Amino acid sequence: NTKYNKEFLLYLAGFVDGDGSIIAQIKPNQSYKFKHQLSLTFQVTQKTQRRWFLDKLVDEIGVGYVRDRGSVSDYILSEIKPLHNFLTQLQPFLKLKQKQANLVLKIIEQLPSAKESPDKFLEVCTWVDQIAALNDSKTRKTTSETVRAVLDS
Template sequence: MKNNNMQNKGMKIIDKDELIYLAGFIDGDGSLIAQMVRRHDYKFKYQIRCTVQITQLKKRRHFLEKIQESIGYGIIRDRGTVSDYVLVEPKCVYWLLKQLSPFLRLKKKQADLIIRIIEQLTSSKNSAVLFVQLCRLTDQVALLNDSKSRTITAEVVETTLRELGLI
């Protein structure tokens, strides 16, 4: 996943000062999320979704619009009194986190785990064992985020795959 490939698809070169600013924004008001999502149409019945999200009050939506413009990808959605900038395309999340990781402080571990997950996603498409290993890394991200509401864990995925005779 090289930067020049991403630039061809809309991702922009982000200078160091902007990366430092973005890293601070994400450390403060952002979330780096890895989660397992039930997908009945997928071979292993689950998808690992990695997300970069920044939340602001709606009155500060313009900050999110500037971030979206800087990155060149992602969407902004409004919910209630807040707006979220959301980036979920794995190649884009990877590209951004590879650049941001050196500047992150609070969320560096999450970023590095998500980078590892995305690097191995393609290989896991044909290996239930590797997919479960990536689900365990996903659990580690959730633990670092103090996630309280998640119900799908690596253990749940592994049990499902055993019941299906895939491992």
């Protein structure tokens, strides 16, 4: 229920439209009722020499974490409830990635019913794919890609 400052949201939306990522993924996981688990991730990446900017985002957003990946680092926010509150506030200012944000919110509002319904879940799976297409990523996998995801998990 953190309320963010509008000038911050305006600058961060332009930053996100230029280089941030709003991503959803469905990965195989035998512990889940439908054998797959959803992950939702707002991500900003910088070279490690500007990791201060990512640690600053954690201070300013109040949630999320920074992870190192060698010569780059990311700010990651993947907790559902703070992610919903953050993207609800950022969305009105996004111009290139607003549809990704809208779909993540739609997915999150559907998760209680996706826990029990196969139909509700499979429909989340279609919105996951719509996000990937908006992100210019692959939305369809070959048989080898599917089995390899299973093996990787």
